[PDB]
Amino acid sequence: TYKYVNLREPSMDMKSVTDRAAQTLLWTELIRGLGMTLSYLFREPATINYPFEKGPLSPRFRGEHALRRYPSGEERCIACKLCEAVCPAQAITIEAEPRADGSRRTTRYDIDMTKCIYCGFCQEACPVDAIVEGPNFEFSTETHEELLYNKEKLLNNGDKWEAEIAANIQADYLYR
């Protein structure tokens, strides 16, 4: 149930001594290393042509956050604050009140993307599938405050990426 790595004694007949002396004087293992490197020279490299070719992803992938809607236009977020109660970095800040038809909705739904740890506890804690962490990962900004999303930016992320987020939830939701 254990093995001795490097407990080999070399052979001391004249054949193996002459073989190791030819290995020393004529550099056999160095030519082995050169041969393996030359073998990789004649291969197809694994370099995908970004930005035209993309690394493969799954429908579980956790990227940019987005607030989803029902298939009628109504937003899903009913202000229940589980996503900011389970958020391990306190990136989500929610302020709510009954809106003009008496419905439980949010007035403030902020996600600080520069506190966010992209672990997806908010999308698995949301009882109505409102907050999700969608597929976008190419959203680098040139200023810090552009990565402090309010409710408007997250709803626009949902309206932007809904035709993909709905399909990824349709692909994965039986595992959840």
């Binding site: 694994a46 391990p88 970095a89 993307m113 520069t114 506190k115 992209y118 680098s140 810090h144």
Partner: protein, 156 residues
């Protein structure tokens, strides 16, 4: 005018030579540097873009702050950034370098490297993927492409 055309083409030449020869520096801090090594890995391959590491700050062009900036290393970060010759750029990788991240309310963490150095590109993620980091690097190249150095010299 002719001189505006000449300084426009020379701006295009120097912006081409600076965005197509970015030399980052071997400088990571935390988990993002593993992914930054994956951006150097043969799948995404920074070196096809001219992006290749130089360990010294004197011969580096961009500093990718890849990881968590604590209080104990913030003067080391500032002196490393200071020892880069101009033009030098800063790409902030990951949430801890962007805004403190998962250690934001900590006693020992600088809440974003933009308290220390001027930051050009903020790359979001924990970690951002190597593809997202390469997206941020190509956005930095697009930011260098639209610089107007000699035009603003010609107009001032």
């Amino acid at each position: 005018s002719r001189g505006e055309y000449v300084v426009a083409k020379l701006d295009d030449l120097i912006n081409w030579a600076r965005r197509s020869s970015l030399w980052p520096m071997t400088f990571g801090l935390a988990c993002c540097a593993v992914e930054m090594m994956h951006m150097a890995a043969p799948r995404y391959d920074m070196d096809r873009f001219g992006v290749v590491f130089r360990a010294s700050p004197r011969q580096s062009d961009v500093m990718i702050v890849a990881g968590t900036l604590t209080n104990k290393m913030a003067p080391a970060l500032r002196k490393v950034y200071d020892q880069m010759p101009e033009p030098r750029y800063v790409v902030s990788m990951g949430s801890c370098a962007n805004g403190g991240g998962y250690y934001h309310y900590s006693y020992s963490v600088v809440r974003g490297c933009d308290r220390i150095v001027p930051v050009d590109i903020y790359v979001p993620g924990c970690p951002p993927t190597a593809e997202a980091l390469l997206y941020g690097i190509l956005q930095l190249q697009k930011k260098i492409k639209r610089e107007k150095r000699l035009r603003i010299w010609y107009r001032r």
